[PDB]
Amino acid sequence: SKGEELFTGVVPILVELDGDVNGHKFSVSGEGEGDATYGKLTLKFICTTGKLPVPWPTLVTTLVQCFSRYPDHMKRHDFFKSAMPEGYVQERTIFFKDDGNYKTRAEVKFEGDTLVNRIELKGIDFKEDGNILGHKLEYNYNSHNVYIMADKQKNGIKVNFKIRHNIEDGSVQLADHYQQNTPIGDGPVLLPDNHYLSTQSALSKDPNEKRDHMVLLEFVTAAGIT
Numbered sequence: 001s002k003g004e005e006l007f008t009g010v011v012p013i014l015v016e017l018d019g020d021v022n023g024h025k026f027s028v029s030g031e032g033e034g035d036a037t038y039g040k041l042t043l044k045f046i047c048t049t050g051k052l053p054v055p056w057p058t059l060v061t062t063l064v065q066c067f068s069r070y071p072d073h074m075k076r077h078d079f080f081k082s083a084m085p086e087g088y089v090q091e092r093t094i095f096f097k098d099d100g101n102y103k104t105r106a107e108v109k110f111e112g113d114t115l116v117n118r119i120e121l122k123g124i125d126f127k128e129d130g131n132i133l134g135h136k137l138e139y140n141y142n143s144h145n146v147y148i149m150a151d152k153q154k155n156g157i158k159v160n161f162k163i164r165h166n167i168e169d170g171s172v173q174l175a176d177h178y179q180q181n182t183p184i185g186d187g188p189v190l191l192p193d194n195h196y197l198s199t200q201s202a203l204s205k206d207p208n209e210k211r212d213h214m215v216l217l218e219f220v221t222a223a224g225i226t
């Protein structure tokens with residue numbers, strides 16, 4: 001409705017994250033655009049503090065599900081856009097198997113015509129020689145499904161899914177994601193029936209960019225109903 005009409009065209013996106021993983025502090029700034037009509041996201045992220053101390057793929061999920069394409073028949077299940085423009089809080093705990101965890105809190109809302117994702121990330125219990133702090137993950141990203149359920153008690157949603165990061169030896173580093181989103185405003189939101197978002201992502205590098213960075217192209221579509 002009101003929220004849905006804010007995404008019918010191309011919307012500029014800004015992402016700002018401050019992180020601390022095992023005491024390694026860093027900041028990331030991202031810019032790009034989203035076109036929910038095609039579930040399309042294009043963004044470029046920059047580590048503004050120097051070298052990123054964790055692998056870029058591990059930050060992908062943290063670094064705007066309101067850009068998902070919801071088929072017309074599923075639009076009544078789109079919580080994310082319904083919370084706009086006031087926005088929502090997105091919180092996650094990401095458990096890296098046999099390693100540490102990230103806890104994140106983000107506020108996603110409009111500032112003017114720009115969709116902004118402001119994030120604080122805290123990582124603890126990482127192994128200094130593990131796949132994360134040791135940078136043993138390939139610079140790529142597998143397709144992932146996100147499973148969404150209503151959470152009535154918080155007037156929001158609960159989300160869970162698995163991400164499998166590719167290790168450079170051919171193995172896999174699992175990152176189990178637990179997520180909750182709650183509206184910032186007190187207006188009504190769409191509480192959905194169970195469904196999922198199917199996402200595909202491609203990571204690349206800007207050949208003229210010398211700062212540590214990540215270019216991302218992502219397509220996201222809601223599914224699972226009718």
Ligand code: NA
Nearest residue numbers: 100124125126
């Ligand atoms: Na402890």
